[PDB]
Structures are given as structure tokens and as C-alpha cells.
């Protein structure tokens, strides 16, 4: 066994003989229970595409909270346990709030990701609070270093990506992103591209029935994180449907 | 047991010597050998203390 499900997770003050505590490995499993969130980076912004799992059609906007607004240039698309999803949103956001007051300028993503990553690992250390167990992405367009996309997993590892997907179909999705181009092209061409990857990856042993939500954070929306318009969403989706078939 | 052990141990050294009886030299050596070994086994607060 590379993990024990009772023994060495009785407290969050543990380590394990390999070097990594089992609670963190379980926290990657928590993200597997939910659907996929993809986010592909341009040089004019980031575009997210998350599939949102639905049980009813009485759902309206601000339901499930797959897209959060961390700042007025920082966007977040999430995947995994929605419960956990709210605290990670707070952690990134509070860091952003102090930053904005004091520094007085747009946040460079290179600093935010490491800074947040410290905090995500910091819950894991403590046994005052349990590790996190949702995974998120930060995608930003700024003049501070351009468009940049990071992914921070519940362990507290931060890495650069032009294309990251976190889910239960993250491995299958990431390979799929690498075959397509989106690296140098505008957010307007890209939106169409984020949608199709979600449909092609979309399996019936890793995901369930979904309504598409996509999001901007780039030059078209003038920095700020907004959800794509319904009209635009439906053209990006219309390509996504065609591309599967 | 330690006192029984000192007398017995003394007798064993004397045979080596080619004697049939103990001397002072053997009797005193026996005392030492039984007690230090006991004190080594029993103590374990002594590592660089007392």
C-alpha cells in the first residue's frame, strides 16, 4: 500500500515513510469526484471553460460557483469539492485585497501563485484545520507580465502552464490541449477552442450531464473577469458540439 | 546473588593460575567483575551523566 485510509491521517500532524502524507493524496481524489475545469492561456488573456454538473433546471447564475472573481484582472476556474471551493476563493482573494491596498497596483501572477501556494500548503501542516481538497487555476491578464496561467493543486504545488486542466479527466485533457494551438492567438478565437476540448475529453465514466460555462479575462472585457455573453457562449458551444461529432 | 557470584567467580580464576585455591588477588578481582557488569546493565541514565 502506498496509502492507508486509517493510520497516518488520524491527525494532520503526520508524515508517512515515502515522504508524503496520505491526506494530501486523498485530497487529489476529492478533485476526481467532480468534473473538469480547463483553462487555456493566450498572450491577450486567459480563457476558462468549465463543465458544470447539473441536477436541476431551476438553477440560475451564481450556482455551483465554478467561476470566482478574485480581482479585477484575476479570474479563477475551479474543479473538485464545491465546499472546499469557497475557502480557496477566500485565501487567494484576501491576499489580493491586502496587496491592492498597500502596493497600489495590478498583481503579477508570478508572485501570487507562490504566495498563495504557501498558504495552501500551510493548512496541510496544521492540524488546526484539514488540508484543502479542491484544485483551482489562476488566470490573469495584466501589463505586469502579460497573460499568465498557473495551476495550484491541493498539495500546495504551483506550476506554469499555457494549458492546464484539473478534474478526473486531467491527464486525458492535457494531452488533448497540447495537440491544439491557442498559445499566441486571441481570446476571441480561443473561447471556441476551450469548449471543444471539454466535449471531446467528456467521458461517461469520468463525468455526468453538464451545462457549459465559459469565462473571459483578457483585453476584450478590458482586464476584468466576466462570464462570456449567452450569444457568444452558444457560438463557442456550437463549434464544441460540431467538433465531437 | 551478587555476593555468591563473587566467591564462585574467584575460584574460576585461581584454576587458570594453576592453583587449587584462591588468593587475595583473585578474590578482589571477582568483586569488581560482578558489580560493574550489574551497574552497566541496570543504569541507563548514565550516558555522560552520573
Amino acid at each position: 500500500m502506498s496509502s492507508i485510509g486509517t493510520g497516518y491521517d488520524l491527525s494532520a500532524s503526520t508524515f508517512s515513510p515515502d515522504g508524503r502524507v496520505f491526506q494530501v493524496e486523498y485530497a487529489m481524489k476529492a478533485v476526481e469526484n467532480s468534473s473538469t475545469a480547463i483553462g487555456i492561456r493566450c498572450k491577450d488573456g486567459v480563457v476558462f471553460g468549465v463543465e458544470k454538473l447539473v441536477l436541476s433546471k431551476l438553477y440560475e447564475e451564481g450556482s455551483n460557483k465554478r467561476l470566482f472573481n478574485v480581482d479585477r484582472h484575476v479570474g479563477m476556474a475551479v474543479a473538485g469539492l464545491l465546499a472546499d471551493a469557497r475557502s480557496l476563493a477566500d485565501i487567494a482573494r484576501e491576499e489580493a485585497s491586502n496587496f491592492r491596498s498597500n502596493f497600489g497596483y495590478n498583481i503579477p501572477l508570478k508572485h501570487l501563485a507562490d504566495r498563495v501556494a504557501m498558504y495552501v500548503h500551510a493548512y496541510t501542516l496544521y492540524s488546526a484545520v484539514r488540508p484543502f481538497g479542491c484544485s483551482f487555476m489562476l488566470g490573469s491578464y495584466s501589463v505586469n507580465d502579460g497573460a499568465q496561467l498557473y495551476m495550484i493543486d491541493p498539495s500546495g504545488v504551483s506550476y506554469g502552464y499555457w494549458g492546464c486542466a484539473i478534474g478526473k479527466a486531467r491527464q486525458a485533457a492535457k494531452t488533448e490541449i497540447e495537440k491544439l494551438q491557442m498559445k499566441e492567438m486571441t481570446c476571441r478565437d480561443v473561447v471556441k477552442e476551450v469548449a471543444k476540448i471539454i466535449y471531446i475529453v467528456h467521458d461517461e465514466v469520468k463525468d455526468k450531464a453538464f451545462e457549459l460555462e465559459l469565462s473571459w479575462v483578457g483585453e476584450l472585457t478590458k482586464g476584468r473577469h466576466e462570464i462570456v455573453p449567452k450569444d457568444v457562449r452558444e457560438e463557442a458551444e456550437k463549434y464544441a458540439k460540431e467538433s465531437l461529432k | 546473588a551478587e555476593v555468591k557470584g563473587v566467591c564462585t567467580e574467584a575460584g574460576m580464576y585461581a584454576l587458570r593460575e594453576r592453583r587449587v585455591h584462591v588468593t587475595q588477588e583473585d578474590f578482589e578481582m571477582a568483586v569488581a567483575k560482578v558489580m560493574q557488569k550489574d551497574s552497566e546493565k541496570n543504569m541507563s541514565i548514565k550516558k555522560l551523566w552520573k
Binding site: - | 593460575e17 594453576r18 578481582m29 569488581a32 558489580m35 560493574q36
Partner: protein, 158 residues
């Protein structure tokens, strides 16, 4: 309740006197007490060499294990050479002596030669060497001759 490295040294020197009379029992009893404090080094080179040299005399002639005698002698020489003069001389001849009884020439010749051997090697290296050849060859006559000529030095250390 006391043993010390210096206390062992009196007993090492007592064993040596006993070996010269040709009595192993009283010496063997004494050897034990001496090696035990020795195991963990706590001593200058001179004590170490004495402990090595005595352990060797008892093991060589008396108990008759040549491999055991020699090994201690090699240490004793190296320790002896630094502080001492007369002592070192003895220990080198003794190295040759173990192997002469074993009756191999090969080891004797190798030992005669440079480890630090050349300086202390005196006329007696040749006495020890001439007797080895005499045992090997099976000539009694060769032996009598080496004893007579070399004798003063041979006699001095009992």
C-alpha cells in the same frame, strides 16, 4: 573495583617474566585483565605495544597458534619503534620467530624487509634468519653454529 591502563602494564611485564621461566598459567590469568581494558584505546603508543607484545609471546610458543601471535607482534613493533630503542629490537625478532616454528620461509623473508624494520634490524635478524634456514633444510649443525656466534644478544633478553 579498579582497572586502569597503567595497572595493566604492570601485569603485562609480570607475564613476560613468567614466559621466560616457561610457565603459561599464571601469565594467562593475568593476560585476560590486561586485554579487557585495552580494547577501547585510552593509551599512548607505548602501552599499546606492550599489550600487543605479551599477548603474542603467550600465543606463539606456549598455546601454539602462530597466526594469533604474529598479528599482535606487527602492532607491537610499530608502537615500540617511536618511543623506544631496545624494546623495538626484540619485537622484530619475535615476528620472525612465530613463522620459523610454522616452518614457512616465505613469511620470514617478507618480515625481514621494509615495514620500518631496517633500523632496529641488528645482527640478531641474521641469527633468526640462519635458524629458519637450518630448520627448513633439516640441518642441526647449522643451528648449533648460529647459537654460539650470536649468543650475547640472544641471551640478554631472557
Amino acid at each position: 573495583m579498579d582497572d586502569k591502563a597503567l595497572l595493566v602494564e604492570v601485569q603485562l611485564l609480570e607475564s613476560k617474566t613468567y614466559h621466560a621461566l616457561s610457565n603459561l598459567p599464571k601469565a594467562r590469568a593475568a593476560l585476560t585483565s590486561a586485554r579487557t581494558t585495552a580494547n577501547a584505546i585510552y593509551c599512548p603508543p607505548k602501552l599499546q605495544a606492550t599489550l600487543d607484545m605479551q599477548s603474542g609471546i603467550i600465543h606463539a610458543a606456549e598455546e601454539k597458534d602462530w597466526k594469533t601471535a604474529y598479528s599482535y607482534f606487527y602492532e607491537a613493533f610499530e608502537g615500540y619503534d617511536s618511543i623506544d630503542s631496545p624494546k623495538a629490537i626484540t619485537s622484530l625478532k619475535y615476528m620472525l620467530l612465530c613463522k620459523i616454528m610454522l616452518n614457512t620461509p616465505e613469511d620470514v623473508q617478507a618480515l625481514v624487509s621494509g615495514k620500518l624494520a631496517l633500523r632496529y634490524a641488528g645482527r640478531q635478524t641474521e641469527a633468526l634468519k640462519c635458524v629458519a634456514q637450518a630448520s627448513k633444510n633439516r640441518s642441526l649443525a647449522d643451528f648449533e653454529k648460529a647459537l654460539t656466534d650470536y649468543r650475547a644478544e640472544l641471551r640478554d633478553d631472557p
